[PDB]
């Protein structure tokens, strides 16, 4: 396998990397605690597209009932860490 033990800061960096390449949102305004519907004015379909992008980038797929209620990068990071059992 030789898979490195991905950590919380690595997950956050990857999440922000994926988000900053989504040109619908400006990289400067976004923050780890920024919202999606209100702080960035993104559509529901747009949020689904972000969720699918993180799905493709991380190699594991999020169930719909849990994907439809993720609205901040911080809670996305927390969900991924809980899925992958990350200590720190």
């Amino acid at each position: 396998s030789d898979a490195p033990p991905l950590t919380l800061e690595a997950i956050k960096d990857r999440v922000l990397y994926v988000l900053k390449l989504y040109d619908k949102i400006d990289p400067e305004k976004l923050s780890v605690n920024s919202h999606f519907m209100k702080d960035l004015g993104l559509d529901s379909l747009d949020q689904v597209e972000i969720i699918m992008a993180m799905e493709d980038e991380f190699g594991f797929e999020i169930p719909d009932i849990d994907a439809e209620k993720l609205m901040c990068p911080q809670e996305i990071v927390d969900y991924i860490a809980d899925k992958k059992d990350v200590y720190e």
Binding site: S44, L45, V48, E55, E61, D64, D66, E68, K83
Partner: protein
Amino acid sequence: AFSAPAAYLTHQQKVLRLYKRALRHLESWCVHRDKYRYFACLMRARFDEHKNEKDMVKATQLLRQAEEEFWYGQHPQPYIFPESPGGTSYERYECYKVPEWCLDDWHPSEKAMYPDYFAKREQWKRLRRESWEREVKQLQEETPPGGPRTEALPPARKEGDLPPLWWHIVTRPRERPM
């Protein structure tokens, strides 16, 4: 898996799930990235043209021919992530997950190794022993009469309190125990 379900799915949830499935199967059909992006944008365009419809009878009339069209062109062999409920490695490691309580049956000679781990284990067991007594009363006083209506559990409200029914969610074996 984590979140408790609702009694029903709203129209918005059905539309979002159909959108996700359609995009996934379109990606499966269009192998390459540029083709996938082009046709995903086209599908989004054809998907948002009825975004602002007001009446619900016509919206429910839609999303039916949409589902039929999806079922007709659903790529009978879609792409499934390896850890998904259809993937190649769905339950591969489910044979390595040994429950925590098994450690209570270890021989004292086996427990002689790893002493610190078992000390922390006793601390966790004591914590659970007190927390359960608090949680049963908290849940008893918090639930409405006639039984719960949804399977959502309340968090801990006091200072020393712990969330009700936490032991078997906290002590999951691992994602890949071995």
